[PDB]
Amino acid sequence: NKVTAQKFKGLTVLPPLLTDEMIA
Amino acid sequence: FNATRFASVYAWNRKRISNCVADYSVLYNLAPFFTFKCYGVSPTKLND
Amino acid sequence: KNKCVNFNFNGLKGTGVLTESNKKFLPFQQFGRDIADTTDAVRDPQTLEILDITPCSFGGVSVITPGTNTSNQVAVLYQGVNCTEV
Amino acid sequence: SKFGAISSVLNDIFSRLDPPEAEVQIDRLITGRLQSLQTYVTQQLIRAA
């Protein structure tokens, strides 16, 4: 909780391989 | 363009053109060697 | 409206999808820009109505494949898009 | 950013100018944007390290 967007220009963010649940 | 008497250079005239479609195809009926030199826009396509 | 079209509004050329706009800018205002400083909302000259401009659908495509030494079948991954819209 | 060109819109340049100097304007804009992308990549690499 303590830690906290539409780009048509060609900038994307890839999701990580490891989901948070697997890290937990 | 077809005015009979143009003003002197020091007291140059000013005219405002607005609210009208501007066709530049006619301007080529001037003396055969008229300089038509432009800055910032290509004279070939000033009709678009 | 509502398709990938090449539009020319008052000498302003572009390519995209024109949609009916719910934006409510004041009557004197003509154009609409964005964060990236490009026109995304426009007002038609013939009929004073508001249009939203959106770039046509695009994305990245990658290929999943085993080694060609053992097989030659492939799969296709379209990144960041619901493939009900491809 | 205009990067010294007469305008910062590609289609604007292609519509207001004939090629012979349109290549010059477009070249200026392209090289500026390419240099910006390079810089972004370089700082990304440093932060990754």
CA neighbours closer than 13 Å in the CB half-sphere of residue D8:
10
CB pairs under 8 A between A and C: 6
Residues in contact with C30: Cβ distance below 8 Å, sequence separation at least 6, in sequence order: C43
Nearest by CB to D15, which of C11, C37, C38?
Answer: C11
Contact: D16, B42; criterion CB under 8 Å: yes
Contact: C14, D11; criterion CB under 8 Å: yes
Query: Does chain D reach chain C with at least 3 CB pairs under 8 Å?
Result: yes
Angle at B4 between CA B20 and CA B8, to 5 degrees: 95
- Taken in order D10, D14, D17, D23, is the CA torsion positive or negative? positive
Counting other chains too, the contacts that C7-12 makes at CB distance below 8 Å and 24 or more residues apart are: C7/C53, C9/C42, C9/C44, C9/C45, C10/C45, C11/B48, C11/D15, C12/C39, C12/C42, C12/D11, C12/D12
**Cα D6 from Cα B45, distance rounded (Å):** 18
- Residue ranges with strand state E in D1-49: none
**Cα D19 from Cα C15, distance rounded (Å):** 21
Chains that touch B (3 or more CB pairs under 8 A): D
D32 token code pair: 């500026």
**Cα D10 from Cα D25, distance rounded (Å):** 9
Residue with tokens 């004073």: C48
Q: Which one, of C57, C58, C54, C56, lies nearest residue C18 by Cα?
A: C54
- C44 sits in the region (left: phi over 0; alpha: psi -120 to 50; else beta) called beta
User: Kind and range of the H or E element at D14?
Assistant: helix D10-16
**Cα B42 from Cα D24, distance rounded (Å):** 14
Experimental method: cryo-EM
Edge-to-edge strands of the sheet including C50-54? C4-9, C12-20, C50-54, C41-43
CB pairs under 8 A between C and D: 10
